[model samples]
Target: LKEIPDVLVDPRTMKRYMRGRFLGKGGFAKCYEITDMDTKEVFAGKVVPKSMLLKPHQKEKMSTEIAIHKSLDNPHVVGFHGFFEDDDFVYVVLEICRRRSLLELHKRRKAVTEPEARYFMRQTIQGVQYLHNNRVIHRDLKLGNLFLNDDMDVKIGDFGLATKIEFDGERKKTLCGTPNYIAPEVLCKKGHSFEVDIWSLGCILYTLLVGKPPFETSCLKETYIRIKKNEYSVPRHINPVASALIRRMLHADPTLRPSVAELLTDEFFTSGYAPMRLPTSCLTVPPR
Candidate 1:
């Protein structure tokens, strides 16, 4: 019932933040651009009301996300500054990604050029490799979750569905993930682990190159059937090397999918022209 404060002060750190523009919103959090009153440094602030966490499970989920994000510090991953709570709401300070996300770029320039897709995939794969090395599974991997900054660098964010493996060979059974990007092992409820993320990367790569998701359909039922059956085709026009990588990545057998390290070394990246740096203009127009 309480309105968000114009000025938020973290009691533990004795730091003050001036809440700025409303950036965006999710299910239970409102994102805002907040500035540190002392240093004048800016950040994207996620503000969640205490009321949203009244349920025990909801609170646990939020806590887990914060913990996972707090432990990660990678160039390709969104930077987590800190988190604090007042009586009315919880405030999570994070690095600002002003350029929005790959989903926007995809909407504007569908079916990006081969080299462009390579650049994007290369960067995203680097980020995914980091997460996997840390034994963290980003259950939800989608274009929207892959954000960009002014420099056109991809930063993986939105860790609400992320989970960390507690021991070796542990498999997660949660029926979670974006509809179009869900892995077959996940839908089969076979207790999957890191392979699900690889499947999602495959979906991401396919979506970038083909202008649509591999198993997408008008109805969820149809899409699931297609996903389970591993029924999708890469147009013949696509390069054989790239198509080969996509095929292996989308393999129904979790053990068959190439590891993250293997993706970087694939011919798709080696035989192609992946730009070391991308121009911001690529976000709107296909790079020539």
Candidate 2:
């Protein structure tokens, strides 16, 4: 088979092979816009430095990521086009898109309108549902990890922290994921099931609609304590539908939290709700 093109080649060669501007950096990767020289197709290449995966744990994490991408195939989930390995890095070629992330959208606009929030929430739930059905738990489901395609379709990404469970017999014991979005069981160090993803989804919805997370503490310890306490208060000023949905999602008890299947039937998110249209220009961000 022919070797995939390298991302670090000269700009002239890149311009001929790839196209478009560079997107911003992530925690452990750099993204670039590229085009297939032969097929004239576009893609976003997320490149991870080899040094970043030097540790045994990091390599394992990368393996898990590749597995998740390979297993998941849904419109709501970001599609992984292919992967390549060079002497110094691992390149993940993904579908190109215009929107940055829900996190970036919030940063620019503070908070999204009710309709916008509903659109994103609905799409995210679909993606999460797919993951759950496949017996995969997305431990990290924050707003920053969710991407928007050129068509304004939501595509959930970043499965580095995801765990695959073949059996549903018992909860997982490992503690992982971003602090604010971490579930109560995870914080308590007790075994947790796929419901942890629901908890994180609640946090993402809360932050997207209210402009902040339900629990905010400068201290990490205090934040974890608040998460365990599960004291989430929806701002009264927001729309009642969204507020009620957040409440249901933020339920303190994991058992009480709505399941992915249950969320689909939520009245707050039913078809009766008004539809939201995204700006074509808004989807102008280069994919990375």
Candidate 3:
């Protein structure tokens, strides 16, 4: 049975909206599909329970999310509309991506072929390169965090774990990210920089090609041991070029890892010695 949604109109702007289907929920917020009555345009409305944002860090995290969206202007990234709050729910308006996430896309089909995997990873690297250029590090980069829009162009999202660095050489000590995606430096708590994101990109490539992370396991102890030792495998089934790229990116030494900007020109990604753009705009995201 479907119950009608209460009026979601903004009292201040009087922007009339019609709530549609409920989207999924995040750690602190649930999202819904919304339409502007006048424009008849659909958007995502994230309803964050204000009560859940009790800790000072929680509110600060949300503010950082908003700030990232505002500062970054990229076609590969999801566009932000605005946010508003009432006593109960804080509404975050974001551009709707009907196709969903890379994780869900992976589930809908077998792991993508290396050609298709390179297509997604290339764009993802571009988005990360853009962020790196801005001196920000996205500590968390995974299949779930890489989003797809209406046209199926995947982009990086969820800036809650992102931290801005003063320069390329700056190091930050934060033990964060999923076990499978965490970099060796991050696991060692040795303080890291943008290279950590590159390492996660390697993990993402492995998952997108093989249908699972390089070192996923139910045993936490084993997982930690493998990640620390950098003991992950790239099966012979994957393209050799891609396998090599993954190995180099996943180097145990953070200093040895290639920066996202450097990887952009690599042969596995470029496939030829001709120095030029790789024509990535037409690169297709995995089929739903």
Model 2 over residues 1-288: C-alpha lDDT tens digits? 233344334323343345357786878788888777667788888878887888897788788788788877898998887676666777777877667787777776666666677778888999999999999988888878888866778898888788888765868887544633888887777778888888888888888778787887788878877877777688789878777778777777888889999887887677454355566444333222
What is the TM-score of each predicted model, taking all chains together? 0.97, 0.87, 0.87
Each candidate: RMSD to true structure? 1.2, 5.2, 4.1
Candidate 3 lDDT by residue in tens digits, 179-261: 33888777778888888889999888888888887888999889889988889888888778888889988999888889877
Off by over 4 Å in 2: 1-20, 176-180, 281-288
lDDT of 1 at 20: 95
Candidate of highest lDDT = 1
Off by over 4 Å in 3: 1-5, 9-14, 175-180, 272-288
The TM-score of predicted model 3 comes to 0.87
Model 1 alpha-carbon miss at residue 210, Å: 0.7
The lDDT per prediction is: 0.91, 0.76, 0.77
1-288: candidate 1 lDDT, tens digit per residue? 698999989878888999999888878899999999999999999999999899998888889999999999999999999999998899999999999999999899989899989999999999999999999989899999999998999999999889999999899887543544888888888888998899999999999999988987899889889998999999998888888999999999999999999989898898868789999999889766
